[PDB]
Structure formats: structure tokens, C-alpha cells
Amino acid sequence: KNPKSDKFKVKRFHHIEFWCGDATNVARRFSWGLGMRFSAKSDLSTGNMVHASYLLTSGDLRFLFTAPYSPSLSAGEIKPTTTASIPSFDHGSCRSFFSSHGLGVRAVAIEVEDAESAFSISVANGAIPSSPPIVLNEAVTIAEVKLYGDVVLRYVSYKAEFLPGFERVEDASSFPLDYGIRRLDHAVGNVPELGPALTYVAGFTGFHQFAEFTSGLNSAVLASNDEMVLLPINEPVHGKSQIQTYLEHNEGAGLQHLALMSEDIFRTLREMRKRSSIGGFDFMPSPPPTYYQNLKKRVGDVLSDDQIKECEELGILVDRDDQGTLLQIFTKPLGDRPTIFIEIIQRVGCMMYQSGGCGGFGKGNFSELFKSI
Amino acid sequence: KNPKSDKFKVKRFHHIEFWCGDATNVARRFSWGLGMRFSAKSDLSTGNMVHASYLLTSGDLRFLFTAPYSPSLSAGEIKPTTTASIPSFDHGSCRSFFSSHGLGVRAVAIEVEDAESAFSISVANGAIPSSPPIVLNEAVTIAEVKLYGDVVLRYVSYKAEFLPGFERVEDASSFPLDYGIRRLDHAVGNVPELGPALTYVAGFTGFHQFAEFTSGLNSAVLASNDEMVLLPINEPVHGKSQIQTYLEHNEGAGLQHLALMSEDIFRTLREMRKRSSIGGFDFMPSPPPTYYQNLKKRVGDVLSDDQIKECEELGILVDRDDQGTLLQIFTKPLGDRPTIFIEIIQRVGCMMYQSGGCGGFGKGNFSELFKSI
Ligand SMILES: [Fe+3]
Ligand SMILES: [Fe+3]
Numbered sequence: 001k002n003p004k005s006d007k008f009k010v011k012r013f014h015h016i017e018f019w020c021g022d023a024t025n026v027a028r029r030f031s032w033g034l035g036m037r038f039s040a041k042s043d044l045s046t047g048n049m050v051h052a053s054y055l056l057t058s059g060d061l062r063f064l065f066t067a068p069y070s071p072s073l074s075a076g077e078i079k080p081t082t083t084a085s086i087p088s089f090d091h092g093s094c095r096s097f098f099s100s101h102g103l104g105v106r107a108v109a110i111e112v113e114d115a116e117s118a119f120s121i122s123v124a125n126g127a128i129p130s131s132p133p134i135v136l137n138e139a140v141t142i143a144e145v146k147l148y149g150d151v152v153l154r155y156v157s158y159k160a161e162f163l164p165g166f167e168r169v170e171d172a173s174s175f176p177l178d179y180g181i182r183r184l185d186h187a188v189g190n191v192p193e194l195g196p197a198l199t200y201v202a203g204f205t206g207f208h209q210f211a212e213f214t215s216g217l218n219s220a221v222l223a224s225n226d227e228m229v230l231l232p233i234n235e236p237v238h239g240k241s242q243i244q245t246y247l248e249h250n251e252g253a254g255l256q257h258l259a260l261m262s263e264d265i266f267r268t269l270r271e272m273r274k275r276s277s278i279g280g281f282d283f284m285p286s287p288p289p290t291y292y293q294n295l296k297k298r299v300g301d302v303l304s305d306d307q308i309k310e311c312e313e314l315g316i317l318v319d320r321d322d323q324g325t326l327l328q329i330f331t332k333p334l335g336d337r338p339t340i341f342i343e344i345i346q347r348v349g350c351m352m353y354q355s356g357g358c359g360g361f362g363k364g365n366f367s368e369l370f371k372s373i
Numbered sequence: 374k375n376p377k378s379d380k381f382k383v384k385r386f387h388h389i390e391f392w393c394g395d396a397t398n399v400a401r402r403f404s405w406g407l408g409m410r411f412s413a414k415s416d417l418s419t420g421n422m423v424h425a426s427y428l429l430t431s432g433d434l435r436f437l438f439t440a441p442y443s444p445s446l447s448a449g450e451i452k453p454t455t456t457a458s459i460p461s462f463d464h465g466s467c468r469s470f471f472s473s474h475g476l477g478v479r480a481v482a483i484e485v486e487d488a489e490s491a492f493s494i495s496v497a498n499g500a501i502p503s504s505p506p507i508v509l510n511e512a513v514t515i516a517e518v519k520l521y522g523d524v525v526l527r528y529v530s531y532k533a534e535f536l537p538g539f540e541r542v543e544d545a546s547s548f549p550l551d552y553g554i555r556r557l558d559h560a561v562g563n564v565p566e567l568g569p570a571l572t573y574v575a576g577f578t579g580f581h582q583f584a585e586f587t588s589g590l591n592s593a594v595l596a597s598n599d600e601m602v603l604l605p606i607n608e609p610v611h612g613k614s615q616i617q618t619y620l621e622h623n624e625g626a627g628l629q630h631l632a633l634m635s636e637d638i639f640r641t642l643r644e645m646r647k648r649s650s651i652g653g654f655d656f657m658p659s660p661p662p663t664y665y666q667n668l669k670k671r672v673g674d675v676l677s678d679d680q681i682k683e684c685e686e687l688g689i690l691v692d693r694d695d696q697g698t699l700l701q702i703f704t705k706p707l708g709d710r711p712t713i714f715i716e717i718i719q720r721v722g723c724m725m726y727q728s729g730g731c732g733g734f735g736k737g738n739f740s741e742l743f744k745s746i
Contacts (some may be wrong), residue, residue, distance in 0.1 A: 004563045021394020022476035022708030028655035032652020044711065052709040060483045067709045070624050095472050102440070103395035175650030203623070251443050277548030279405020335395030337424040338417065 004225045007206035008121050009113035012228055014054075014156050015183040017107035018098050018159035023067040026103065027054040034065060034260075034342075035179030035271055040166040042085040049073040049167065050084035056163055059182030061260060062161070066106075068094045085165030088131035088144050088154075096151050097271075103335035105255035107154040108147060108187045110229055115157035119143035127204035137164035145204065148189045148197055148233070149253030153205075179271035185259040185345055186221075186230040186361070187243070190246045192253060194218055194235035200329075209229065213363045213371070217239040218372030227356030246315060246318030250339045257330070257341050263348035264325045270315040272331075272344070281342065282332040291372035298368075299325060302348055319365045324349025324358035328365070377598045381494050382486035382577035385601055386557040387529050388428075388435035388481035389631060392470050397439040399476065399708075400407075400427040405713075406653030408552030409436060412540040415458040421538065422446040423457035428535055431557030435534070436632060438495055439479075441467045442497030458734065461504035461517050476627035476708035481520060481528040481560045481711075483602055488530035492516035495528075500577035510537035513524050518577065521562045521606070522626030528577075539606050552644035558632040558718055559594075559734070563619045565626060567591055567608035583710040586736045588743070589614040600729030602715070609646055610663060623712045630703070638700045638719035642687040643718070645704075654715065655705040659688030664745035671741075673720055692738045697722025697731035701738070 022024045025046070031038055036056035041050040052124040053066045068091045077083060097106060109153050112118045116133040123129050127145035132154045140158050144152040198220055201207065207222035210230065221232040234256060236243035246256060262268040276282050292312040294307065299318050302325045303311070311318060311327070319326045325348040331341050350358035395397045404411055409429035416425040421448070428438045441464045450456060470479060487493045489506040496502050498519035503525045512532050517525040517622050564570040571593055574580065580595035583603065596603040607629060609616035619629060635641040649655050665685040669678065672691050675698045676684070684691060686702070692699045698721040704714050723731035 018460060020398075020709075021471055022399070022710075024706070024708045025393075025402045025476060026395070026398045028406070028652050028654075029398045032405055033401070038650070069710060070473075072621065072624065084479075098394055099468050099472070100443075102443075103398060173650060175657070177651055235385075248445065249443055251445065275405070275652075277411070278550055279401050279648075280545070281401075286699055315432070334399070335397045336416075337391075337395075337442060 002210050002225075002227070003208050006225045007125055007204070008118040010118075010205075010224045010229055011113070011233040011253065012110070014111040015064055015109040015162075015185070016105055017064040017066060017154070017185065018103065019094050020065055020067045021098055023054050023065040027065040027281060028063070029054060031056050032065060033081065033178060033272065033275055034181060035177040036061070036068075036181070037177055038169050038170055039172050040162045042163075042166045044069070046085075047228075048083050048085055048163065048200065049077070049166075050082060051089050051094075052292045053085065053166070055166065057161070058152060058178060059263070061181055061183050066094070068267065070317075072164060074233055085163055086317040087134045087136070087142065088152075099344065100251045100306070101150065101254055102250070102337045102339065103257070104250070104340050105151060105187075107144065107152050108231070109154040109156055109257070111326045112155045114141045115155040116153045117139035118157075119145065122156040122204040125204045125206075126200065133232050139164055147201065148191050149250075151189065151253075151255050174258045178188075180262045180264040180268040181344070182263050182340045185261040186232055186349075186357075187258055188232040188234065189258045190243050190250070190253060190256040192235065192247060194220060194233055195200045197233050197253075201231070201233070210357055211361065213364055215244045219363075221357075221361065223356065230357055232361060246339055249337045253338055257277050257343050259328075259343040259345050262344055262346050265316060265329075265344060266310050266314060269316065269342055270331060273314065274320045279336070284330045285331055287369055288372050291369065292318075294368070294372060317362065317366070317369070321360045321364070323355070324360075326359035326362055328362050375598075375600070376581050378579040379500055379598045380577070383491075383578075383602055384484040384486070385433075386467060386482070386560070387484040388437055388482040388535075388667040389478055389557065389560070390437040390439060390482065390527070391439045391476065392479040393438055393469050393476055394471055394604050396398070396427050396438040396492075397424045397518070400429060400438040403438070403558060404550060406645065406648055407431065407554060408550040408641075409434070409554070410550055410561050411542050411547050413535045413540045413541055414581060415536075417442070417624065418651070419458075419538065419540045421456050421458055421462045422450070423455060424459065424462050424467075426458065428539065431551060432636070434509050434556050437710045439467070452619050455583045458509075458536055460509070460515065461525075470731065473624045474523065474627055475623070475710045475712065477623070477713050478524060478560075480517065480626070481529040481604070482529055482693065483527045485530050488514035488516045488528040494579045495577040498577045499573065499578075508582055513538055513673045520574065521564050522623075524562065524626075524628050534736050551638040553635045553641040554717070557636045558634040558720075559605055559730075560631055561607065561629045563607050563616050563623070563626060563629040565608065565620060566607055569594060569625075570606050570608075571595065574604070574606070583730055584734065588739055590616045591724040592736075594734065596729065603730055613721075619712055622710045628713055630716050632701075632716040635717055635719050637715060638689060638702075639683050639687060642702060643716055646687065654707070656688060657705055660690060660742055661694055664742065665689075667741070667745060675711050690735065690738045690742070691740070692735045694733045694737070696728070697733075699732035701735050719744075
């Protein structure tokens with residue numbers, strides 16, 4: 001059920017920050033592959049001598065790509081005189097994260113009412129502090145606590161897009177790509193031990209268990225009061241588990257997958273699949289045909305036969321619980337290592353606004369895929 | 374003139390290797406932006422537990438993108454038992470290069486008759502050894518010496534594409550992109566002091582001075598016997614020079630630009646410019662119109678008025694020496710730092726095969742751009 005136990009007021013996912021080697025190349029690949037618009041920047045051209053940061057947006061989804069410049073450009077700065085636009089940035093931590101884990105998510109950012117308040121209450125309730133509340137241009141407050149591994153939960157609060165110090169991208173350079181992606185649905189972490197990770201995060205946030213699963217993994221989902229911030233966590237089950245392989249290749253815990261909601265998953269997948277081999281993202285191998293014939297059966301009130309055939313053309317998976325229906329598909333790993341990947345999703349049902357997490361997370365697609373094969 | 378002084382037999386440029394944070398994302402961005410085909414790989418799927426390496430090709434141009442996995446996957450290997458396909462690879466050097474310089478070229482690779490012989494003679498003649506000759510699957514020999522900064526000159530020789538241990542990419546994943554790029558024309562290094570860098574490299578190769586220039590830089594070009602391997606080197610001129618800015622942002626000397634020959638520079642630029650804002654490469658600001666009106670004058674026997682207007686539509690620059698004509702244009706930096714960039718070029722003249730370096734390197738486009746502005 002839903003105790004509505006949050007320890008502070010949380011609004012919505014706000015942004016995901018990637019720590020990269022070269023922000024430029026990752027941002028440009030992602031823009032093209034996912035259909036996100038180049039919308040803001042913080043770098044040498046805006047007077048940032050510390051880090052290069054590029055923001056891509058699609059609907060309300062915000063992806064930020066950051067890399068460190070040579071320390072030598074800002075060696076004379078101190079925290080009080082910094083030209084960095086994200087005060088929590090550290091060359092050393094960034095290089096260290098990237099060396100250890102390769103390309104991946106550093107920050108899962110949520111918008112809250114009062115970032116100073118959320119930080120204070122989180123730490124008071126057991127959160128490990130990462131970067132203290134700082135007010136940027138008397139307008140925005142940012143703070144960070146450890147989530148799992150070297151991933152931080154970042155709190156953002158606005159007095160009245162992006163951050164101060166970021167410049168909006170002029171239309172010539174800002175081509176309006178858009179393949180239908182609209183918001184972040186969920187962000188999932190892989191950890192060695194689920195129990196303690198749940199205890200820790202639910203401990204400092206007050207997020208309640210929305211779900212659990214028990215072929216490879218045990219998992220559980222933590223959610224905010226209105227269930228619009230959703231944070232699933234997986235552990236491996238030994239006696240490889242895919243979660244175990246992740247941990248080995250990533251050098252420990254970290255973010256496993258980002259699930260992006262599409263307002264039209266058919267159009268999103270047509271557009272992404274067109275570009276897979278020409279700079280974009282590859283997709284995991286499709287289910288056999290026997291999976292699609294079996295879908296007539298499970299979701300017949302939801303999707304017509306032609307709508308199911310469209311799923312089969314795009315390799316979309318469909319799952320259905322008590323209350324709603326889930327369309328989903330997974331990309332292959334986003335970079336060199338077999339670590340982070342993306343999920344594209346769309347939800348049918350639970351209408352009122354649509355209830356966060358309608359249809360679950362696809363845990364029925366486990367048995368159903370291996371039944372078809 | 375041309376003394377044909379090479380100390381060993383050199384054939385052609387063979388490949389350029391980029392050291393990246395995530396090879397996958399850079400390779401996919403480059404493939405799409407430059408129209409190169411994904412043609413070979415060495416990674417976890419081929420049993421390489423040490424590095425991820427992806428090869429893109431367009432005509433004879435070969436771009437290789439490499440990143441290190443977690444050291445933990447191969448911690449039990451020793452050099453004699455390695456699963457790496459490029460024996461010279463080192464996790465530590467790779468991470469160190471990348472931390473220090475960001476995304477950039479590690480190796481300028483040339484095909485020679487005998488790589489063991491070229492290495493021996495180079496070192497005997499003052500080259501600083503980087504990795505000794507190793508024979509791969511009794512079929513290919515690879516060796517490396519220092520070129521400038523942390524860039525190496527790599528020698529490759531074949532008994533009878535790519536390397537052993539690399540697998541060819543299956544056609545489904547190998548989309549046949551092609552925007553007209555066909556081979557590497559030249560590879561340019563930025564160094565603090567030109568004199569000593571020339572002395573060193575000409576010292577160990579026997580390459581002769583093809584050229585020199587003397588607004589910002591002093592430069593000189595070294596070339597092989599048949600002038601098909603061309604290696605220009607720049608130094609800054611103080612009292613910023615763009616070469617100086619490079620050095621600061623790159624943390625010292627390294628590769629400045631790669632010049633890619635196109636069999637149709639108009640088509641290449643149409644295709645690249647279409648994709649700049651959708652995952653591809655941005656281009657430096659175009660010359661004013663006054664530059665194009667002035668081209669009627671300088672190159673009237675080479676290009677018609679409509680051919681010149683096509684140059685103006687694409688922002689192409691044209692330069693012309695004693696013997697030939699050069700069409701060229703420069704991309705903006707390829708990654709986060711204001712360091713490495715790409716040049717697209719096509720040459721008219723010097724026909725026999727076309728003479729290496731026909732038309733020079735565009736040093737006339739210096740005064741001519743600032744005359745138009
Ligand atoms: Fe998911
Ligand atoms: Fe050049």
C-alpha cells in the first residue's frame with residue numbers, strides 16, 4: 001500500500017547527470033540516437049574554466065553530460081572564486097569515477113521544495129553527505145547525498161530551465177530533434193546487497209516500498225509520496241547473474257538503467273531503430289514470434305491485433321498487472337562496458353493524470369520471454 | 374626538393390587510433406557524423422578482457438576507438454597470456470593519457486614493409502621506443518616509437534583488413550554509411566618547440582621537409598619518399614596563438630588535426646552539415662561573401678562560377694599554389710576540449726596517381742581570410 005512517509009517534499013525527477021571523458025562526443029551521440037535537443041551549456045564559451053557541461057532535453061526529460069577540463073585552467077581558483085557552474089564538481093572525483101566505472105550516471109537529480117531542508121533531514125536520518133546545500137545566483141539550491149556506489153542523489157530547489165551559469169542554446173545550433181521521449185519514469189541501481197541498500201535509502205528519504213521481485217536477481221522499488229519518483233534496486237542471486245556481471249565490469253554498485261517514458265513508443269522505436277547503425281543506439285535481441293502470438297492472449301483487451309503486430313515489428317515487450325499495461329524495450333549497453341543501458345516505456349491505464357508506475361516494471365516478461373523461447 | 378632519404382620503406386597511412394573513455398559512444402558518434410562504416414571489433418564478445426576496440430572505415434581511411442575495461446577482468450593475465458588484441462595496450466597509460474589530454478589520438482599508424490626493421494632502424498637513429506615489435510598470429514608485426522607528446526608513431530607490416538583478434542562486423546550491424554571520405558591526407562602535431570621536434574622525427578625516419586610556414590604559428594611538413602605520408606608540425610609564436618591555447622587545454626603537445634581526403638568534397642560537406650546538429654560534427658564559422666567574390670579571381674581556371682557558389686554554400690575554402698589547387702574546411706573541436714579537430718580536403722592537379730600534397734596545406738588561406746574580413 002502507500003504510507004506516504006516521505007521525510008521531505010519531493011516533486012519530480014529533474015535531471016540525470018553523466019560523468020564522461022569527453023562530454024561533447026557523448027552528448028552529440030545521445031542527441032542523435034535518442035532524439036533530444038541541445039538546449040543549454042556551461043563550458044569555456046560561457047566562462048566555465050573547470051568543467052564542460054551540455055544539456056539535452058526531450059519534453060521534461062533532461063540529460064546532462066559533464067567532463068573535466070585540465071586542472072591547469074582553474075588552478076588559481078578556490079571554491080569561493082570558482083568558475084564552475086555546478087559547485088559540487090571536483091576534477092579528482094570526476095576522473096576517479098570515470099577511471100573506475102567508465103561512462104555512467106553520477107547524479108540522479110530530483111526537484112524538491114527546499115533542497116537545504118531535504119539535505120538537512122536526509123543527513124539527520126542517516127544519509128551520507130556528498131555536497132552541502134549551495135545557493136546559486138540567489139535563485140537555485142543544490143545539495144547531494146550518497147545514493148549507492150559513487151552515484152549521488154541530488155536535490156534541486158528553485159525560489160521562483162536549467163541552472164544559473166548555463167546559457168541557453170541559440171536556435172541555429174539547437175536543432176529540434178524529437179522522437180517522442182517525454183520524461184524519466186524510473187532509475188535503477190545495481191548493488192551487491194539489496195537489504196542494506198533499501199534500508200539506507202528508505203531510511204533517509206522515507207520513500208516506501210512500491211515493489212519487489214524474487215532467474216538472476218532480487219529487486220525492490222522505492223517511491224515518493226505520489227509515486228512519481230521511482231527508484232528500483234537490484235542485487236544478484238548467486239548459483240552468471242547479469243547483476244553480478246554488471247558489478248564486475250562497473251567496479252561495483254551504480255546505476256543500471258534509465259527508463260524513459262514515450263508519448264508514442266511505436267514512433268520512438270521506429271525513429272531509434274532507424275538510427276541504431278548510423279550513430280544511434282542498438283537494441284537487445286527481439287523476442288521470437290511465439291511471444292507475439294502469446295500476446296493476443298494476455299493483453300487482448302488492451303491492444304488490437306494490428307497494434308500487437310506493430311509491437312512485433314519493433315521488438316516491443318508488453319506486460320500487464322492488476323491495474324495497467326506496460327510496453328517496454330531495452331537498449332544494449334550505452335558505452336564500452338556491459339553496464340548501463342536504457343529502457344523505453346509507455347504505460348496504459350490507471351487514469352485519474354496517470355498513476356505513477358501503472359502496470360509495474362515488466363517482471364512478468366521474465367517467465368514470458370523464456371516461455372516463448 | 375626531394376632527397377628521398379627515408380631510412381626504411383614506408384607505404385601509406387594505415388590507421389589512426391583514438392584513446393577514449395567510452396569507445397562505444399565515440400565510435401557511434403563518429404560513424405554517423407563522418408559517414409564511416411562499423412567494420413571490425415575487438416572486445417568482450419571476441420574474448421578480449423582487456424580493452425574495447427572498434428574500427429570504422431571509409432574507403433581506405435581507418436579510425437580505431439579504444440577504451441580500457443576494468444583491470445579486474447584481466448588481473449590474472451600476464452603479457453604472454455594476454456587477451457588484448459593490441460599488445461602495446463596498457464590500462465595505466467591509457468587512463469593516464471585520457472585523464473591528462475581528454476579524447477584524442479594515441480597512435481598515428483603507418484604501413485611499412487618490415488615493422489621490426491623500421492623499429493630497429495628508428496631507435497638506432499634516435500627514436501624513443503614505446504613498444505617493441507610483436508608478431509601477431511604469425512601474420513602481422515606491430516611496433517611503436519614516440520612521435521610527440523604522448524602520441525606514438527605505430528609501424529604495421531603484413532606477411533601476406535585489420536589486425537588478428539579483430540572480428541569482422543556482420544552486415545546487420547554494419548550499415549554502409551559513406552559521405553565520400555576516402556583516405557588520410559595528413560596528420561598534424563602541436564608542440565612547444567618546432568625546431569627540436571622536427572630534428573627528432575626527421576632524425577629517426579629520414580622524412581624530408583616538404584614545407585614550412587612562418588598570425589600565430591610557425592610550421593613545417595615532413596614527408597616520406599613518395600610524399601604520401603605527410604606529417605606537419607606546428608609551434609606557437611608568442612606576443613593567444615591558437616597553438617598556445619591547444620597546449621594549455623591538452624596538457625602539452627599532441628595531435629592537432631586529421632585531414633581527410635574526400636572524392637567529392639561538395640557531397641561530403643552536404644552530408645556532414647546535414648548531421649551537425651543531430652549527432653554529427655559542427656563546422657568553424659564560414660568566410661564572408663567577399664572571400665567568395667575574391668575566389669573568382671584566384672582560381673578562375675580551376676573552378677567555374679557555379680562551382681565557386683557551391684563552395685560558398687558549404688563554407689569551403691580554396692587555396693592554390695604553383696602546381697595545384699586545394700579545397701578545404703575545418704570542423705570545430707571533436708570533443709570537450711578546444712584541442713583536436715578534423716579537416717576535410719580535396720586536391721586538384723599534379724596528375725601523373727596524384728602527387729602527394731598537391732596544392733599545399735592552405736597557408737594562403739591565412740592572409741586571404743583576413744583580407745575578406
Ligand atoms: Fe525498468
Ligand atoms: Fe591540414
